[PDB]
Amino acid sequence: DWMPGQPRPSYLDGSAPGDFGFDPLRLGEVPENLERFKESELIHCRWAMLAVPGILVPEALGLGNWVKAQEWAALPGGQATYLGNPVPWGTLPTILVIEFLSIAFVEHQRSMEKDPEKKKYPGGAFDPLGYSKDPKKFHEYKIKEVKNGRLALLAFVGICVQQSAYPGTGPLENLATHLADPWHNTIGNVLIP
Template identity: 50%
Template sequence: MAATMMSSTFVAKVAPVRSQLRNVRVAAVSNGAKVTCAAKPSWLPGSTSPEYLDGSLPGDYGFDPLGLGKDVATLARLREAEIIHSRWAMLGVAGCVSVEALGYGDWLSAATASQQTYFGADVPFDLGTLLAIEFVSMAYLEGKRNEETDPEKRCYPGGAFDPMGFSKDAASFEMMKKKEIANGRTAMMAMLGVYCQTSTGSTPVANWLAHISDPWQVSVASNAVAIPYIN
């Protein structure tokens, strides 16, 4: 009986408090109050991103230790340069690997051969002529790109460069921008690795095959060229 009376008294005292709390919560919702606690991704957990890197750019993780992007115009120029280099690096890595994987020699000897071939077929131009054609073509394309004044269109021109219409859906387009820059950054690092592998006297695919065949004995740690004085 005493327990019942104590329980009833407790409920009687708590009920008005619950009612008041419920009223406060309803009032907050009815006033349109909304709190979001989503954290911006960071390249280094716990670090503070610069104010000018607010997460609005694709692939922005607050990485700018030298403060190169403080100026708005400089940030736009560096962003464009990174995207262009990323695209070339992705094409370059694919080309370097595919040449060797398909049995047409390694990327360095194939590019400097006196007789150029394309998938086994002879190309009717020597290396000097091919370089001249490439130089003129690139100069023309870069000139046309520099005629564009819209910074977004300079990076994502659309039109003929989006034949499948991937940019029509805004949400999907933003996601693809993030994927492109992420893959592009990886490709730039991979292309740097391809360049460095020439010092080993081997080639990318050959190095990879040697590593997976004996990963504990063949790695960057066993390469005296990559890490001097380890042997």
């Protein structure tokens, strides 16, 4: 139960992975919408779980933060740098056409499959190590993925809001600024200018 003392919704019995009874707006009242929401929630969770380290790790290294790493495309002759290497295809129209064709193909492949249970957990080629072996352990891994991904989503929100509250920052730069003086470096200064 997400909120002790609160009656769980009628349609949330706790059986689903990551189902703690949280839908205060009753957005899953219709079952079709709820299933679609489980799929989409997992998609966001996995994009976030991939994108958070892609945001943090290049910052720990000498490379720019996640904001600076997008900046060459604003200027016309822009060329990307992967690990300091001016990659030749780094021009914006190149990687842009590449990204459109590749992403569009893959994601549209997800659009043209309706199991619907495979739209959440397809497996097969995407489970070569076969972690779907024990359905108990596979379901516990479902709770694992859902909580990890929700955590990553919250973290991403923290990164975007910190970026708005300190334009041209880094999550770890913000963290270090806090570690300097935690009692005088806080969200309190942003909430209260």
